[PDB]
From Swiss-Prot, chains A, B:
Subunit annotation: Composed of two chains; the small (or glutamine) chain promotes the hydrolysis of glutamine to ammonia, which is used by the large (or ammonia) chain to synthesize carbamoyl phosphate. Tetramer of heterodimers (alpha,beta)4.
Protein name: Carbamoyl phosphate synthase large chain
Organism: Escherichia coli (strain K12)
Region (Oligomerization domain): 46-195
Residues reported in the UniProt entry to bind ATP 2: R357
Functional note: Large subunit of the glutamine-dependent carbamoyl phosphate synthetase (CPSase). CPSase catalyzes the formation of carbamoyl phosphate from the ammonia moiety of glutamine, carbonate, and phosphate donated by ATP, constituting the first step of 2 biosynthetic pathways, one leading to arginine and/or urea and the other to pyrimidine nucleotides.
Domain comment, as recorded: The large subunit is composed of 2 ATP-grasp domains that are involved in binding the 2 ATP molecules needed for carbamoyl phosphate synthesis. The N-terminal ATP-grasp domain (referred to as the carboxyphosphate synthetic component) catalyzes the ATP-dependent phosphorylation of hydrogencarbonate to carboxyphosphate and the subsequent nucleophilic attack by ammonia to form a carbamate intermediate.
Taxonomic path: Bacteria, Pseudomonadati, Pseudomonadota, Gammaproteobacteria, Enterobacterales
Curated annotation (Swiss-Prot), chains C, D:
Positions of L-glutamine binding: S46, G240, G242, L269, Q272, N310, G312, F313
GO terms, molecular function: ATP binding; carbamoyl-phosphate synthase (glutamine-hydrolyzing) activity; glutaminase activity
Protein family per UniProt: Belongs to the CarA family.
Active-site annotation: S268 (nucleophile), H352, E354
Keyword match Amino-acid biosynthesis: yes
Domain Glutamine amidotransferase type-1 span(s) in chain numbering: 192-379
Protein name per its UniProtKB record: Carbamoyl phosphate synthase small chain
Record pathway: Amino-acid biosynthesis; L-arginine biosynthesis; carbamoyl phosphate from bicarbonate: step 1/1; Pyrimidine metabolism; UMP biosynthesis via de novo pathway; (S)-dihydroorotate from bicarbonate: step 1/3
InterPro entries: Anth_synth/Amidotransfase, CarbamoylP_synth_ssu, CarbamoylP_synth_ssu_N, CarbP_synth_ssu_N_sf, Class_I_gatase-like, CPSase_GATase1, GATASE
Gene that this sequence comes from: carA
Entry-linked CDD domains: GATase1_CPSase
Amino acid sequence: IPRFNFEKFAGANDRLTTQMKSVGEVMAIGRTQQESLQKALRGLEVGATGFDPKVSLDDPEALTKIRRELKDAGADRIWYIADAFRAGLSVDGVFNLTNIDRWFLVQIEELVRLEEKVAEVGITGLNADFLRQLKRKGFADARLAKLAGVREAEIRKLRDQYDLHPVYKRVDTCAAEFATDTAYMYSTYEEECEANPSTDREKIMVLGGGPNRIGQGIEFDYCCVHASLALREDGYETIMVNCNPETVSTDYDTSDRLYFEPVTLEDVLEIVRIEKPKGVIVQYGGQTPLKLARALEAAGVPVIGTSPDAIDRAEDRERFQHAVERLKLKQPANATVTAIEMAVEKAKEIGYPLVVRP
Amino acid sequence: IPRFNFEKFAGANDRLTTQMKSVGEVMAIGRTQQESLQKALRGLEVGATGFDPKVSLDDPEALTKIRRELKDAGADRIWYIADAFRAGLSVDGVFNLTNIDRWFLVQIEELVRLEEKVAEVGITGLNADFLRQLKRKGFADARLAKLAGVREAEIRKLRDQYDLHPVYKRVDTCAAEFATDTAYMYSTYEEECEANPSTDREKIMVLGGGPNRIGQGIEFDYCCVHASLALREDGYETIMVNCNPETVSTDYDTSDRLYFEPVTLEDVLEIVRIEKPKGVIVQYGGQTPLKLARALEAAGVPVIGTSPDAIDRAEDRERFQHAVERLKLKQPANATVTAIEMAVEKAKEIGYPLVVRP
Amino acid sequence: IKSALLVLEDGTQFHGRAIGATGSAVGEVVFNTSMTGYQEILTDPSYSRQIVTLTYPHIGNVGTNDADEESSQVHAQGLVIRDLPLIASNFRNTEDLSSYLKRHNIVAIADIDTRKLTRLLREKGAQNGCIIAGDNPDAALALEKARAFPGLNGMDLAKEVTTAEAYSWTQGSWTLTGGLPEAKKEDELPFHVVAYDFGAKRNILRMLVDRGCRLTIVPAQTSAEDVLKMNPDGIFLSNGPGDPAPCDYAITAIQKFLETDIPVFGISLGHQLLALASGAKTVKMKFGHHGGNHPVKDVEKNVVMITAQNHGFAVDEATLPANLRVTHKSLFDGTLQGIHRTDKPAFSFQGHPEASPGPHDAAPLFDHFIELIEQYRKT
Amino acid sequence: IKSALLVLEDGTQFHGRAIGATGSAVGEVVFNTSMTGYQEILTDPSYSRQIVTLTYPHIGNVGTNDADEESSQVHAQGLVIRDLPLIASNFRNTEDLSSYLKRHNIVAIADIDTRKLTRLLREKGAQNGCIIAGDNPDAALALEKARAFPGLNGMDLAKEVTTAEAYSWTQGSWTLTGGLPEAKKEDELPFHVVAYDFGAKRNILRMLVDRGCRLTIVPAQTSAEDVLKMNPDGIFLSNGPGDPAPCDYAITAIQKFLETDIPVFGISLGHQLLALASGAKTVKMKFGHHGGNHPVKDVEKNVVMITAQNHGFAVDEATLPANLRVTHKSLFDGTLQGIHRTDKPAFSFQGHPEASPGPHDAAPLFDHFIELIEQYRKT
Ligand SMILES: [Cl-]
Ligand SMILES: [Cl-]
Ligand SMILES: [K+]
Ligand SMILES: [K+]
């Protein structure tokens, strides 16, 4: 799935054409297309958890907006396709506008219908069979949580209760016809697991940044690669977690073990759960892993290097302002303004010109 | 189907609710719901020929209107439902907005699909089998003509060619378990005909006015009935053609033969085809039958009383003035204008205040 | 395109569409005027060897469901309809009509002028026929099968539909809230009734249970001796297909019961058998009674009931023995509908008090029965 | 919920869903790596008595069609897939896969861990199995049937799929634009090839015809004598199911033809029969070769061709009589793929030059045949 950055180019024509406009791409592997597609959606780093809705069901103009988005593709087309199904458009109706083969469309439609059931039965309806079913289709704990109006952690926990965890398959070029000595893996919800983690080596996990985007380029990947090469050379067993198909970090050669998965809390915890690494590196992949720092630690993940709290102290303006202060360091005069007038006055205080960061 | 008159109440709220706002109703009988329904639409006297479209397929906004018309029913909903299916909405989508049971909805979708094939294959594709399947579903020759891009009379002529005519069944209260000596019929495209017209009598056919509307009330029905009663008593075999369920004209006791059909050229002609009446009355049932006079007459139908020509002479603004002019009578000063600036000057001529008739 | 064809003995052809299994069906053709209740109808054993034509145009509107089966299987030999709707639309539905048909391996055709058929059957009387659903249905072949059918007159179908071995029945009627109940317990039902299975409908069973009857359902050919040995509170003569006349074993066994003071109750065929056992005569009707709107007069009380009917034969009123009194007549044709033994605790009804499908107007017929069995127990 | 279950000889159970006929299926379980071509696979007689497992998860994407059938029926004993798509989406589709399976009465299961299955077969070799599709699949029962399976070793299947009586074939290859072409007039085909039907795929015939061959297909057990009498320009030994070894008749006839100068060419099974008839030895592979991505090197020319393979047995390379020269070997495993008689105009190939499904890389094998024929006629 390509990664775009239209939000950084306001006056730009944001419709897709023959000239590329994308700035990166994510890749996902699944036993099925649905599973594959959904994992890619959650791996895109756009905040989606899968088919998050774009228009309100109560919007009187919804079908008209949907239609345009469909008929004239932009970056969000994919989500609009799911909206169309929620709004009452048929597979033939969607086909006609998008020219996307019905073979794919029916699958998206089926996932929507599954979502309607989740919404209807709520967390209560989330029995083992149903949940397993949903997981097999690629649903993220986060997407199911939103549908059942609970926290993501609640869905995860439920999986833990049911002993509902994914298994890992390996990439091998030959559909299992021959064995592999490489550990290039992907998660799926199935029977047999091919992970066979070692008990031997002390392990270090390196979290990648997912798809490239403006501001989150190859620079961060170069770092992930060097962390892996160095620690491995040093004797550690190096495990890489990433899903960018264009990178050296996702080259099986780069590390001891490669999990080609979305860099998300849900996907990472599953890995950790079975690898039980000595440490996990979240500072090398950009914003993507950086934001999972707290939740990872909170789930008992062994995060190495600068603490998640430490990271926040630097990332939170306020926390940062104190530190500076405590340090007796110079920083531009600032001020959080709520209201407009509160702003025109504060501004006077600060003095012009002004750097308005929301 | 109910008949409304919102156009006469421009400032009125036209959404359907628990307080009635219809002014009449039409009824139809068919051997299948599809047939019954289409027959009712063409007998409704609103100018429909079946599911004529309300919006255009190439309106960016069409879906917004369709959504509104479906969610909050007005008198036109039945038409928007078909527009909905032409626009890619599914049965469930429509269900969701209307709450109209899907058993009825699938049948309307099917008709649209068929209409799509007709538009597609055109007149040339109107082969006997196809033509017959269409008639069987209640399609009006006029609806088919619109879809194929031809005149209604072309379709008619074609049916004539394939010798494709309806048969007449009888209402008997008991699903044919017992014979009936009453002649209360309706048309259908089936095998056996139960009309069994007399060869005996001098027949007089009276045409009713369909559903009652403002201006076209019971007064017209009353005349129709009187004609039937008087002539029957005089010894003629009386034939009533009408589809207003509320009236006396449609009570089987009122005439020797009752055809519970839409008062249309198509339906009327099929009746004349087999009854071979001595005469037909078109001046009693109001605007409905009157508008049919010229065409009936052109088709060879024996119209009695004041000729369609003579009727036209009075109803034709020009012809009339001509005749008034001719008899040496007074009529107010008048003129035909086209442009506004035209009126303004003509008005000057005529002298306020004015009567501006569209 | 899936072709189907109906051909009657007389040569009349009906060209339509296959909606069931591919193959051939042959038997007596009949018409039923029920606007609802098709499943129940198909599953009624009385329709054994009968090709059923439904007069109501749209058949299959509410799909099908277990609760709606009046027997283990579909007894109709074939199904004739005007239109099979695009979808089934009803909360209770579990399988659409076509599928159910194919499932039960039934040959069925739609899209024919059922009105013409009915009028023909009414005017000229019942006819045998054959339906061929298949790639290129051979009219000539259909016609021979039609002509070769031996006819239901003189045909004992009860022996073909009854159960092999006897059995207990203790399950009550279905309800909207609960659905089909759970089988009661034997100590839960005061009376013990022996029910001769001449191809009995479940509802009859369910309704007796509802009245507190623990049932023992036996094979048609069960001896009186073998029955009496059960000390029954009452005996019940089921409904069933074909001619009653050829069921010697039953007329005989009943004859027996008539010597006793045990309460006897029959419905339809049972009614006919009871009459046979009393020395009355039976005739095959012109086209019979099949529908759920038939008015039947309780002559005793002068009241009308709207009933459920499904019978090709009838008891001749003029052949009726002094020991049989007329309890009911049809308001549609004057035919005999119910009778009672002057001398015995025995009575029957030509229609179906248990409906399913149809009006519940005749359910009270069941009470008379109970009353008897009760008075018979005081003794 | 329509359950299906697959059990292997070893006790291993796979619980999934029924996608074909209700019933059971017993056979040798194999895995096939082909990403496209599932219909051609299923219609391959060489799959007789084998339960086929496809490694590519989505099976049925393109539905089915009659041009994609490699024979008159579905030869697979059963089908094991990971996922059956909601719809078939291809302009050539005439019937969805499930419907097609039902029609062919094939027991199929979907929704199982096919990769697990595949890894098991690879690691532990072929195993017999049973698939049970129905209401309550009894696992102990499945296990039983699997275990009771005789096995394909020493089992002659060629005799079971062979044509009853001889016949003529003059039809060529399908084209995008023309589809399956009309059969040619005998006069239009220069050569006459006599073909032994050991369970021949239609595409072999089609492709030979494309090359100017008019064919006469004969039962597997046809005698050399009866064959020589026809005056064949060439003799073709088809592909087929089971053990080639138990086919004494064929081996015997083949030997008879070799004393002659007639060109001989076999494919897969026919390749082993030739080998045997020449004194070679055949073995049954651990799991075999089934897929369409198999590298095969032509050792004379030193080139590689990607091929379609379908075989459970092989010809031993170390036992080759001196009259047999090695022309091709598998690049995946070095196993024997081709042989040519050093003294006779007889040769063969273990894979499928006719693909269907698969890469067209090996087509040229046929060409050599033709050449031999043309030169046999020059005499
Ligand atoms: Cl017909
Ligand atoms: Cl499994
Ligand atoms: K027909
Ligand atoms: K499974």
